Point group: C2
Chain length 436, copies 2
């Protein structure tokens, strides 16, 4: 039984405060660390920041920590909840908060307790976390599926100088036969990309962005794409490795048009593109490069560009900003045949029960699910166990650099090794790893 | 009793393979992850890499993993060693290897087992690791000392474009009264430095180097120093925060002279400096900026420049490359009054017993000890517990960015919170935190 709920402030991969919760039970102390989320709300669970400019640039989570310590803890202990009953845990928490975006208590206070309890339930059930997660979500367990990691190697957009508008360029070793093998291949291409970058753009080009990719001053998508294809060729893994794009198109959508030179700052409106001209530029790229996934190709409310595009896409289309892990937003998205894969960010919704629910509805409509990291990650490896229990077949967790990224990839190495013949790598079936 | 010793390959913060060892005992599985070290040996324990160019760019540790699995494990189990008896563990391991630089078995195979056993001993003794470490080293335990963290904020040297020869610029919040307070202050200066950098050098200037600092194209030490002082001023922590320098002077020493424009590549030999002219440039910087620590100010065998300088330094002088955590090298260094602080890199020597021994001899000569991270770190937080048990008062573990760095700073937050009034922050007494 839960005898104590405690929260403290710790730092995230960007040096910003975040919430760490500790749950005590007769089996020990279970901990969770929350990735840094949004504190101003779309259709998303809100994260609560002190706003005190004289401290941490106004990003303490001292309140959020007080909410755990002062409100949840007391109530939760007395509630005598069975941690095994996750829905009960979550329902408890949501009822305590009483708002729709966890703005009363803060999504950060709530999620920390929600995740610590699944750790506590797995201990108690005496099963590895991934297996407990498979039980909560009613996933097939024979065998388990190891995901194709979508490794960030290069960034543009709001992440760099240069005129490159698309935000992330990812590589996906679909051709490997094991997770260990895909991770080794992925690191060699990455290491090769770094060499070429330092070579063609200079030593400063070697520095990494928040998630581990390089961010040289590149001018076009083709330029960036060409560099990655060269790196694939040089690591000698030509044909085994694919590309994934995160366009973050919400960033350059203005006036019902898309500005590919949004860092302009003298961008010719004669040159902005409509949904359909943009669809045309992606078709082009798609014919020339091994792209198998495009994330947020159109803006978060540009429903008709999604649908139109989606009709002839023929590759995996991931909704991230369009759906914001919101089931009302997921249902429309499905209804409209806007995409076929959901980017799941557990902290965009704030609770493990609602995260699982959002994956299940996706799966029921034939969508795939890409589990994802946040910009501000921690040393917590929870998403490694979740992507395995959800059986999704694909995770987006950073470049094979910075341990907030590698902690998760190391954890999948370990689970893989532990499952023996009870594990299969999703490979080329990443889209539908759930149906393998 | 140790019932099983197992090793696997996992990745380090740079995406390169490294060794993870698991030790099983009747209390559970204790794990350790080794930072990436040297595989070609100075006067240092050698790290063993497969050299197979067709795999991980020739950096697998598959052999090293075989050494654990195939040689140590079998032998160690049968030896029936008491993990509590650390010296016995280490002596066991060294005897198994039989070379002076752990080149038989690989320092990476050996250290992993050496550290897993101290974890196992602490479990068994039912004490926190830091307390077990305090027992092995016979450190005062009342109260414990929390260190001043030396945070890397900016890099030059072999780490950047620009003509700046000095390698690392660190900030040290000596004026804080708690570790939690020093870490918050340190992050605000850091965040402020990032803003200024992006401002004055452009968006690419915002990308971080291996350890978390920025690496803009700076021309001189003064330029870099001025930027940090501005950042200190803007975070509003003027006077509470000091600067630490790592010159890595071995990198620009040529012909018995020091080339401050070593990226030249047309560097005027008319302009190289002798020991004594270099001593003069540091004296200058020291008068103008709040510098309290200089690391490797002269080259690793330039004994007379060290001594001369050391005579009038009046600040902490850290030997890193000069001593390479080697006690024969430490004794000369002491004998010669070359410096007064040792940079301790547990993996430069390969064993916890020898690491502690090297700190004790330093302390006996009145030197201070700065515990340090490696370029290629992991998610393992062992150095957080070590700096507390050794009672050194100062640790060098990266910028407050990248979780291979923050994992250790988060761990010190936790220990601090746990010690209650039994902990003091070394503050301004960082040099001698051992004597507090």
């Amino acid at each position: 039984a839960v005898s104590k709920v405690y929260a403290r402030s710790v730092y995230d991969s960007r040096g910003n405060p975040t919430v760490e919760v500790e749950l005590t039970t007769e089996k020990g102390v279970f901990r969770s660390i929350v990735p840094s989320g949004a504190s101003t709300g779309v259709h998303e669970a809100l994260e609560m920041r002190d706003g005190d400019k004289s401290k941490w640039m106004g990003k303490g989570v001292l309140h959020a920590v007080k909410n755990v310590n002062d409100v949840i803890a007391p109530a939760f202990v007395k509630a005598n909840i069975d941690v095994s009953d996750q829905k009960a845990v979550d329902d408890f928490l949501i009822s305590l908060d009483g708002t729709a975006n966890k703005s009363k208590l803060g999504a950060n206070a709530i999620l920390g307790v929600s995740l610590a309890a699944s750790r506590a339930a797995a201990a108690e059930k005496n099963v590895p976390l991934y297996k407990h997660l498979a039980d909560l979500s009613k996933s097939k367990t024979s065998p388990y599926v190891l995901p194709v990691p979508f490794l960030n190697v290069l960034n543009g957009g709001s992440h760099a100088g240069g005129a490159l508008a698309l935000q992330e360029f990812m590589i996906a070793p679909t051709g490997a036969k094991t997770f260990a093998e895909a991770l080794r291949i992925g690191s060699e291409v990455y290491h090769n990309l770094k060499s070429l970058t330092k070579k063609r753009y200079g030593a400063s080009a070697g520095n990494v962005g928040d998630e581990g990719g390089v961010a040289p001053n590149i001018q076009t998508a083709e330029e960036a794409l060409d560099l990655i294809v060269d790196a694939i060729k040089a690591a000698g893994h030509d044909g085994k490795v694919k590309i994934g794009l995160d366009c973050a198109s919400s960033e350059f959508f203005k006036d019902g048009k898309y500005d590919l030179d949004f860092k302009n700052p003298n961008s010719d409106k004669s040159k902005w593109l409509t949904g359909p001209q943009l669809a045309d530029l992606y078709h082009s790229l798609m014919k020339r490069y091994p792209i198998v996934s495009i994330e947020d190709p159109f803006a978060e409310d540009d429903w008709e560009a999604w649908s139109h595009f989606f009709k002839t896409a023929g590759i995996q289309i991931v909704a991230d900003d369009l759906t914001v892990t919101n089931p009302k937003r997921i249902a429309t998205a499905i209804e409209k045949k806007a995409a076929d894969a959901l980017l799941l960010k557990v902290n965009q919704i704030g609770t493990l029960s609602e995260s699982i629910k959002a994956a299940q509805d996706s799966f029921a409509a034939g969508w795939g699910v890409m589990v994802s990291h946040r910009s501000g990650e921690t040393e917590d490896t929870f998403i490694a166990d979740l992507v395995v229990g959800l059986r999704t077949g694909q995770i987006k967790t950073g470049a094979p650099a910075r341990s907030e990224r590698l902690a998760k990839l190391n954890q999948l190495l370990r689970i893989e090794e532990e499952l023996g013949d009870n594990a299969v790598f999703a490979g080329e079936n990443f889209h539908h790893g759930d149906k393998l």
